[PDB]
Every structure is written in structure tokens, then in C-alpha cells.
Write a protein that binds this ligand. Structure first.
Ligand SMILES: Nc1ncnc2c1ncn2[C@@H]1O[C@H](COP(=O)(O)O)[C@@H](OP(=O)(O)O)[C@H]1OP(=O)(O)O
Length: 180
């Protein structure tokens, strides 16, 4: 009744803010997942959850935690992964940066930056922050320099994801150059 809604809501917020990948979910750039996919993910822990139950959680949430648009759902705040909540485009940046561990560099040079268990990749306007973000993934980080105008001309819109972080669907190898 009351504890039911709270325990399901706690899982909902964790999934939507923190680790959609632990449930096989891939949010779009605005942080939405489909309502059906979220229900199926909740159902693995609480089999009694239905779409109507999730809708009532959203409608009755005292803090504005969630938003349903059409048949997709997101958390409105508190994300620990890069999102562009208002879909606001970065049009001014000329160069973006991504740090790749030297071990992962062969596949990235051939294929570019491809999204993995996510719908988009993340890069930075700042080369030092790009290298620090890459260091989290392994040693001997190699700096990739990304031509933002090449990305836009190729049809990839670049979105602001807070401070110096940007997200984009993928980065083709043609928009990438190496640096020490
Ligand atoms: N009823 C509910 N529905 C969803 N989520 C809930 C929740 N009741 C609590 N949470 C979240 O638990 C985290 C620690 O909260 P406390 O123990 O400090 O109160 C924090 O989430 P996070 O770790 O992402 O910041 C809270 O979310 P919120 O701040 O929205 O209540």
C-alpha cells in the first residue's frame, strides 16, 4: 500500500538516475526510457508492478521526481550519468576531447567512438577533464581531439550535459585526431 509505492519508487529513482544499464536500459539524450521497458525492468524485482502503477507513482510523487512524456519516462533531476535534460545544443564549440586508455585505442581508431550499452557517447570541452575521465577507465590515456564542425556537418547534434560535458550519438573516425 504505502510501503509498496515507496519501495518501487526507490528502485525507479535508482534506475532512472544512476544505473539504467544494470537493467539493460538505454536512456535517450534527455534521460527518458520507454515506460514499457522500465515496467519490465521493475517487474524483475517486483513482479506485481504494472504500467498503471508506475503512472500513479509519477502522478502522486510529492517532490516532482519523475516525468512521463508520451510513453517515455525519466527522472527530472539527480542523474549521475551525463544527460541533456532540455536538449540544448552546443553550437559554439569548435573542438571537443575524449580520453581513451591506450589499450582501447585500436578499436576506437578504426570505429570511432560508438555508444556501448547507452544511446550516446560523452566528450568534454576541456582536454584535462577528458583525460581525467579516461584515466578512470585505465592507464596510459590517449587524448582524442574531436572536430565539432565535422560532427555537425555529418548530422550529429552535440548537446550540453552540464559544465564542460557534451553528449553526441557517436563520433565517426573522420572527426578524430590523436594528441599526446
Ligand atoms: N520514496 C522514494 N522514491 C524514490 N527515491 C527515494 C525515495 N525515498 C528516498 N529515495 C532516494 O534515496 C536516496 C537517499 O535518500 P535519503 O536516505 O537521504 O532520504 C536519494 O536518492 P539519490 O541517492 O539519487 O540522491 C533519494 O531520492 P530523493 O532525494 O529524490 O528523495
Amino acid at each position: 500500500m504505502k510501503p509498496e509505492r515507496k519501495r518501487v519508487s526507490k528502485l525507479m529513482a535508482y534506475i532512472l538516475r544512476h544505473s539504467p544499464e544494470e537493467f539493460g536500459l538505454r536512456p535517450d539524450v534527455e534521460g527518458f526510457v520507454s515506460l514499457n521497458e522500465l515496467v519490465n525492468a521493475l517487474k524483475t524485482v517486483y513482479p506485481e508492478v504494472t504500467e498503471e502503477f508506475v503512472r500513479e507513482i509519477v502522478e502522486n510523487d510529492p517532490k516532482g521526481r519523475y516525468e512521463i512524456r508520451g510513453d517515455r519516462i525519466r527522472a527530472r533531476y539527480g542523474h549521475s550519468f551525463p544527460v541533456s535534460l532540455d536538449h540544448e545544443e552546443d553550437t559554439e564549440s569548435r573542438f571537443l576531447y575524449h580520453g581513451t586508455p591506450r589499450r582501447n585505442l585500436p578499436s576506437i581508431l578504426k570505429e570511432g567512438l560508438k555508444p556501448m550499452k547507452r544511446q550516446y557517447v560523452h566528450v568534454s570541452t576541456d582536454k584535462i577533464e577528458a583525460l581525467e575521465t579516461g584515466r578512470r577507465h585505465g592507464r596510459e590515456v590517449v587524448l582524442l581531439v574531436i572536430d565539432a564542425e565535422c560532427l555537425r556537418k555529418r548530422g550529429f547534434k552535440i548537446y550540453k550535459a552540464g559544465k564542460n560535458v557534451r553528449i553526441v550519438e557517436r563520433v565517426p573516425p573522420d572527426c578524430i585526431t590523436l594528441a599526446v
